[PDB]
């Protein structure tokens, strides 16, 4: 009814998406975690590997507080692109894909207290340097590294939502 559209229209009033939450008075804390749907092929010829991930971040933006009967607010992608989200990027990524079929494969939820939860579906090709001295008896530890591109340690800090071991969950069939 009218309450939903009114809250949606009145959230962005005076919102500046060029500025991170708590700019100049606190550090934006981002709780992140990953669900690996499939650990894709590992191409030792290219020293790369593919991984399909539900990558979901969460933070707090008091600018987007609201009140209503509803405690959860879903944002469409047009409005989700109109607010500040972390500029997370993969340090060892080569060519990653943000899925868009049939509509952008991302979601943005807002809680009444201003907590944002931002989920994405990604296919990331990442570098895996290999020591092939003991080939074919060799073993490797392929990394997946990510973080903010623009915001330094004193502005944005990432953390794991749960214990770090339990914050990256690989699917049984994946």
């Amino acid at each position, epitope marked *: 009814t009218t309450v939903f559209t009114r809250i949606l229209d009145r959230l962005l009033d005076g919102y500046d998406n060029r500025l991170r939450p708590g700019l100049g008075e606190r550090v934006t804390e981002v709780k992140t975690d990953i669900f690996v749907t499939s650990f894709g092929p590992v191409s030792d010829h290219d020293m790369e590997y593919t991984i399909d991930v539900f990558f979901r971040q969460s933070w707090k933006d008091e600018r987007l507080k609201f009140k209503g009967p509803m405690t959860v607010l879903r944002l469409n992608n047009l409005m989700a692109s109109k607010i500040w989200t972390p500029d997370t990027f993969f*340090h060892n990524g080569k060519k990653s894909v943000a899925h868009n079929m049939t509509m952008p494969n991302k979601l943005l939820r807002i809680t009444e207290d201003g907590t944002l939860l931002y989920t994405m579906r990604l296919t990331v090709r990442a570098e895996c*340097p290999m*020591h092939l001295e003991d080939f074919p008896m060799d*073993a490797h*530890a392929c*990394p997946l590294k990510f973080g903010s591109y623009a915001y330094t340690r004193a502005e944005v800090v990432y953390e794991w939502t749960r214990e770090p071991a339990r914050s990256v969950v690989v699917a049984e069939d994946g």
Partner: nanobody
Amino acid sequence: GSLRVSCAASGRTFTTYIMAWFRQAPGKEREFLAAMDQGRIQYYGDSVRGRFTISRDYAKNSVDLQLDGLRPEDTAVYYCAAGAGFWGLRTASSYHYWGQGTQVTVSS
């Protein structure tokens, strides 16, 4: 006090390997301190987070550890390690190469 412990590797180029420092106090327990990667990413242990700083000179193939805010309880033997971190990056079993070690004592 302030101190700096350097580690020079000879016989192999560890540009693509992870170079780390470990500590062993009396009692036979080896403790992870710091590690640095080919991507220049610094990992630290909780006990020495923000106190000890790890750096690598890839041209010289060396790894340095700057120790600051020493305390009497920090007396121990410090070991330099290298090797790709398989099942590890915080476990001594994942490192194939180790050095003689250096003794450190602090008196108050």
